[PDB]
Structures are given as C-alpha cells and as structure tokens.
C-alpha cells in the first residue's frame, strides 16, 4: 500500500502522474561532491533542477523515479531537497549501471544482493532514505559480472517487492537476455521493466517482450539528434530517429493490445558528466521541455493519432502504479 | 615552508619520521559511505584505524602520506578523524588512481588539471582540507587516459609546487615512460616518486631513474605471499619475493650513491574494498606490525646490514621532508 520515496512513503493513489525513467543528475559515485563547480555548483544545479521539477509539475508531473543508482553517482541528498523544494515526489534506486567501480564489479551475487537489500530496506547511506526501485543494465551481451547484477537485482526484488528496470541496448534485444537471467532467478516479469526500448523500431522484439509479461519502457522519446548530424557525440548518444518515430511504439504497443505493460518516461537530467562536456547544453537544445515533454508533447501527440483519453491515462497513471506498488511473489 | 595535512599546515620540522605512501582504506569513490557494512562498520574502521596508527606511532612515525585519490575512495573526514584520534600527521591525496568512473575518464588534460588544482589550493569536497601529494598510476604502458592525469598531475604540480607520486607495475619498467612524460611537461624529476619500485628485482632500471633524479619508492616490502601459494589472488598481489629481498633493494640503492633518493613505505591500509573480499584478514596475517614494519623490522635490518644511523635518518626523516615541501621550479 505504500511507495518509497525521498521524503518517506506514499500511498498508491497519491502517486499519480509518474515519469518512470529520469535523473536529477547523470554523473559518477562521488562526483557531484568532489567536484560541484562541475556544474557550475552544487546550489546552481540544484536550482536548475527545481526550475525543471516545478514546470514538469504545472505540467501535470506528480512524481518522477530516479534510476540514478550508485554508480551514477546518484545524491539522495540532492533528490530530497529538490523534491522538497519543488513539491515533487521522486522514487529513488539502488542496483548497478555500467559504470561500477572496481569495490563493487569484485564481489560476489550474494554480496551484491546484500547492497541492495540495505539500500531497500534500511536506507541509502546513512540518510534512512529507501529506494523504490532495483536499476541494472547491460549494453549488449551482459559481462559476466553484470549476470551477476541481474541476479542480485532479482533476489532483491523477490525479497522486497520492490520492481527491476533495466538500461538496454534495444537494437541489441537487451532485453531477451535481462528476461532469461532473471526467470532464471524465478523472478516474475511483471516486476521488470526493460528500458530505452524506444530505442528500436524492431516491433518484434517489444512485442514478444510484453508477450511474456515485461512492461516495456519506452523512455527515450525527446532524444534526438537530428539537425545535429554534426555533432558525433550527439548523434552517438541521441540517434537519428524523429521523437514521433519514438513516440509511435506507444500507438504500436497499445494497437498490438498491451496498453497495460506500457512506461513512458524521457530519461531527462539537469546535470550530465559522465560523457562529453557539454552535452546537457545540447539536449536542452533539443528537448526545452525537458521533462515536461512526455505531458506537453507526447500525450498530446497520441491523443491526436487516435489514442483515447482512459488509455493515456492508464499508461501515465495506473500502470506507474501498478509497477512500482511493492508486490510479493504469491508463495 | 609548510605541508597540507588533514588537521591544517606543519612546518617542515614537524612531518619528522615519515611513511609516504599509505592508506586509511583502499576502495572506490562513494563506497565506504554507500556500504559502510563492507567493513564491519565505518566506526570499526575508524576504530581499526586508529589502533594502527596509534601503534605506528608509539614505533616513532609521525606521519603519514594517504596516497589515496578521489577513485581510491579516499574519505577526507575519515582521515582527519583517525589523524585527530591518533595524533598522527596524514597528508591527503589528489590525482587518479587506475579505476577512474566515466565521469573522470571523459575528461580532457584542461579540466583534469583544474580538478586536481581544486584539492590541492582550495579543499577537497566541501572541508578545506587541501592535498600535500599528487597520485598516478600505470599498470603497463599507459592508457590515452592515463596520459592525459600524467600530463595534468604535471601542470599541478608545476602550478602548486606540491609533488608527484605513482602506482607502477615496476617489473614492466613503467617508470620510464611515467618520466618520460612528466619530463616532456617540464616537470623536474625531484618533485617524481615513481612508486611499488621495490616490485622489481631489475636494479638498472632503479638506478637509471635515480640517475635523472626521480625519486624511488620502495613501498611494498612487507608485501609477500611467501607461504601463501595455494592462494591465487594473495600471490598475484603480494608476489612471492620475501621483505628481506625487497628490504635489501634500499641497501642497494644506498650502495649506489642514491641514499638521497629513496622513500620508504608499506603501502599498508585498514580497510581494502577494490580487491577480493578477505584480502584485508590474508594481509593483517602477513604483516601483523602494519604500517610499524617499517620502524620495528626493516629499519634495524638495514642498520644490521651496516646501513649507518644518519643514513637511515636522512632516508625516514630529510627525503621525504625535502620531498613533501611544496617546490616551485625556479625561473
Ligand atoms: O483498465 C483499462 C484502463 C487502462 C488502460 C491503459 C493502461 C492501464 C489501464
Ligand atoms: O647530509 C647527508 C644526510 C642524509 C642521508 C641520507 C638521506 C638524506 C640525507
Ligand atoms: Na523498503
Ligand atoms: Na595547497
Ligand atoms: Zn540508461
Ligand atoms: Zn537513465
Ligand atoms: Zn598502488
Ligand atoms: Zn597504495
């Protein structure tokens, strides 16, 4: 009955409007605290970032789920804070990206398992704050020691009931393999939701996904780089392909008859350092709305192909609730 | 006039018998605050710590260098804490050792220098507690990235007059490029410790280093597997050369002429996260004295080698003052 967030639990219903896929701040364990001018400072991107919560929120944005794990040196400190300030609520995450460290690629599932579980269960650092969510991710083939994060992912989520969502490499199908590591673990996939999937035109692929129960997330909707095709960094990270093209899938998904295992999100960030200098400039660029895109552009963009009014809510609203309320495997 | 350490600046008579180059705890940016559990508990290392350290102590050392940088986790209010505790000088750490996150690795040698120059000028993190040493590292020919901290280490160095120490793999004469490189920055050779010199049995290589006026650590002589060969990853660390070999490599270097040129170390820790899980209980059954084998066990081997007791005085005591006193090049 109650969702964790960063100022403390919330009940089901006061969820509402939830963004699944999003970050205060893209950056590196200890980063943002070592090296805040980074960023302009600490205060400056802490402001820019209630500018965004409050505009996403006039928007109709009631809650937004920071996947920001450990390793993209995610500052739940910084979340309450802007949450606070921006009347917000924001889901906060454990689990492991691409980027670990080598205290934390050396050990063992069981040990990972136990990370994760603190940071569930008892709190992120010393802060008492509680994760709402289980982040993983593979780019391409999973690495050995990213098995072993999947399954501590899914020994985490059995044991709290806390959901999985996972970063792919959608043109690589990802996320046959995240579905087979975790089954293997006896996870259900109705507490996984297989990210960045917009990321692919292959309706195949998602489809036979939300076939096995898989919610699917399709986050990455205002990336792009067209009219950049200059800018290599930019249309490495970003892509070629139109937000409507993105924003498509959701029409796909909903005709193919899985409008309940849909995530919609824009994977935005106020601050973004774990790539080229300069690239939140240039997603700003692109994408002014930010996180307020998904409600401004996007929802509207459905509704005028076709899609009805109880579908987008249900997408926007129910289906967030469903994913992220705590849920046992029945025994 | 003065060197930076974690409770403030001491002149250069108070540093007196000096370790340069240990640590409180080997791990990874964000981890012991993240995973405090991974060593019992951040009070028992801090209480470990201090135990150690307050040993090393009553053997005669006054201070030690944590060489540990922003990716070795180094936890600047741990270290004031347990200097405080034990009444033991600690000098902090700039730089990047070899498990740098994305954030870091994307960076150009430009802004790589105005990090390191945030330690050391202004603090580190938010507590004013500014670096007195610069830390690198190669494991084998270096990375395009590993180029670039060794170019912006230099400008560091150059800038601040504070000096330069590194993590080598000695048996593949790393030593030589490090220089070659430092060099090719106009940084002079006497601000240089090339570090783990005492991995090498190759004496021609030490001393043509010493020739140029690098400085020479021979920092790992308490480390040996010898009796542990049925442990693969302890013998891969420690190596099967006894501490009296690698002691007898200071005594060699002296014979040399290079008494002037020597720093001498355990590269010892408290806690040790970035390997495997146990490596910290294998190392304490080694080395029971810790960070005192340098005092209690090596220091009379050398004197019952014949090494005089000025010698072995102007090696603990003048080499790393001269080293550690910030030195700007002349014009
Ligand atoms: O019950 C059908 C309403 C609904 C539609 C879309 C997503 C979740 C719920
Ligand atoms: O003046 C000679 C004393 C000395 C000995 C060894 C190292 C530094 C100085
Ligand atoms: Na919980
Ligand atoms: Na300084
Ligand atoms: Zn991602
Ligand atoms: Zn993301
Ligand atoms: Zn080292
Ligand atoms: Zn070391």
Redesign the interface.
């Known amino acids: 009955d109650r969702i964790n967030t960063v100022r403390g639990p919330i009940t089901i219903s006061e969820a509402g409007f939830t963004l699944t896929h999003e970050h205060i701040c893209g950056?590196?364990?200890?980063?943002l605290?070592?090296?805040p001018?980074?960023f302009g400072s600490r205060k400056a991107l802490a402001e820019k970032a209630v500018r965004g919560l409050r505009r996403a929120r006039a928007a109709g944005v009631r809650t937004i789920v920071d996947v920001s794990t450990?390793?993209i040196?995610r500052d739940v400190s910084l979340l309450a804070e802007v949450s606070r300030a921006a009347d917000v609520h924001i889901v906060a995450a454990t689990g492991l990206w691409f980027?670990p460290?080598?205290?934390?690629r050396?050990?063992?599932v069981e040990?990972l398992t136990?990370?994760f579980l603190?940071?569930i269960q008892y709190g992120?650092?010393?802060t008492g704050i509680r994760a709402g969510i289980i982040k993983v991710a593979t780019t391409g083939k999973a690495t050995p020691f990213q098995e072993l994060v999947l399954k501590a992912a899914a020994r985490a989520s059995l044991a709290t009931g806390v959901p999985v969502t996972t970063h792919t490499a959608a043109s690589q199908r990802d996320g046959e393999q995240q579905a087979a590591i975790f089954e293997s673990e006896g996870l259900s996939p109705s507490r996984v939701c297989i990210g960045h999937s917009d990321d692919t035109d292959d309706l195949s692929y998602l489809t036979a996904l939300a076939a096995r129960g898989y919610l699917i997330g399709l986050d990455h909707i205002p990336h792009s780089a067209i009219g950049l095709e200059d800018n290599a960094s930019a249309s490495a990270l970003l892509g070629i392909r139109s937000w409507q093209t993105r924003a498509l899938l959701i029409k796909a998904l909903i005709d193919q008859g899985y409008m309940k295992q849909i995530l919609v999100s824009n994977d935005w960030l106020f601050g973004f350092?774990?790539?080229?200098?300069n690239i939140m400039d240039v997603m700003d660029r692109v994408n002014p709305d930010g996180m307020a895109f998904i409600p401004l552009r996007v929802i509207p963009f459905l509704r005028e192909k076709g899609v009805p009014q109880e579908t987008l809510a249900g997408i926007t609203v129910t289906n967030p609730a469903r994913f992220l309320s705590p849920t046992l495997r029945a025994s």
């Open positions: 950056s590196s364990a200890g980063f605290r070592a090296w001018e980074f450990f390793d040196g980027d460290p080598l205290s934390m050396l050990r063992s040990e136990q990370f603190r940071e992120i650092e010393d350092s774990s790539y080229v200098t």
